[PDB]
Design a protein around this ligand. Structure first.
Ligand code: NA
Ligand code: NA
Length: 193
C-alpha cells in the first residue's frame, strides 16, 4: 500500500534535509496508515522527494487493538522499534532534521519512544505531530521530556481518546485535512526553509 521505508533504504552518503518517522493507528495497514502517507507526501512536495526520507514504524509494531490498554498505550516492543528507528536516523544521518509523528495508538508509541530516546536523539527531533493522541489527557497535552514548542497535538472535538478514555468515535477519523495542511506546515516551520 502507502508504506515508506526510506530511512531503512537510504544511503548515509546522501543524507536528506529531513527524515519523517511516523507510527500508524490501530489496525491500519502498511507502516504509515491514512495520515502518515499524506504527511510524508506534503514534506516531499515542499522540499523534493529525494530530500526527505519518509519512514513508517513497522516490524514489531503490529498496531494491535488490545495494546492500547497497555500502560503507555502501546506494546513495549512497538515503542522499542520507534526508538530503534530514531537511533538509526541519528547513526546514519546525525545532521539531518528528524520530524516524528503518530496517529492514535501510534501517537502513544511516538510519545513513549521520544520520552525513552537519548538526549542526543530528542535534540535531533525538531518537530512532532500527534493526531488523536491517546495520552493527551494523561500527559497533559505534551510528551514527557520534549519541549512544547516542538509539538502539535491534533485532538478533534468529540475524539474521546484525547480525553482520558479509549472510546473511538467518528471524530477520531477526522484528521485527514490536518495531515495534508496544518501538520506538515508545522513540521516545515521546524525543519526550516
Ligand atoms: Na523521499
Ligand atoms: Na479535521
Amino acid at each position: 500500500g502507502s508504506s515508506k521505508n526510506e530511512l531503512e533504504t537510504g544511503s548515509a552518503s546522501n543524507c536528506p534535509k529531513a527524515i519523517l518517522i511516523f507510527a500508524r493507528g490501530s489496525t491500519e495497514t502498511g507502516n504509515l496508515g491514512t495520515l502518515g502517507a499524506p504527511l510524508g507526501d506534503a514534506l516531499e512536495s515542499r522540499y523534493g522527494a529525494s530530500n526527505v526520507w519518509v519512514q513508517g514504524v513497522g516490524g514489531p509494531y503490529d498496531a494491535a487493538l488490545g495494546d492500547n490498554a497497555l500502560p503507555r498505550g502501546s506494546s513495549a516492543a512497538a515503542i522499542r522499534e520507534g526508538v530503534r528507528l530514531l537511533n538509526l536516523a541519528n547513526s546514519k544521518c546525525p545532521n539531518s532534521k528528524v520530524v516524528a509523528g503518530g496517529y492514535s495508538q501510534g501517537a502513544a508509541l511516538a510519545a513513549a519512544a521520544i520520552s525513552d530516546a537519548s538526549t542526543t536523539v530528542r535534540n535531533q527531533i525538531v518537530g512532532t505531530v500527534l493526531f488523536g493522541y491517546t495520552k493527551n489527557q494523561q500527559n497533559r497535552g505534551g510528551i514527557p521530556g520534549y519541549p512544547q514548542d516542538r509539538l502539535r497535538v491534533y485532538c478533534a472535538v468529540g475524539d474521546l481518546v484525547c480525553e482520558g478514555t479509549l472510546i473511538v468515535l467518528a471524530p477520531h477519523l477526522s484528521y485527514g485535512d490536518e495531515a495534508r495542511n496544518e501538520a506538515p506546515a508545522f513540521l516545515i516551520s521546524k525543519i526550516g526553509n
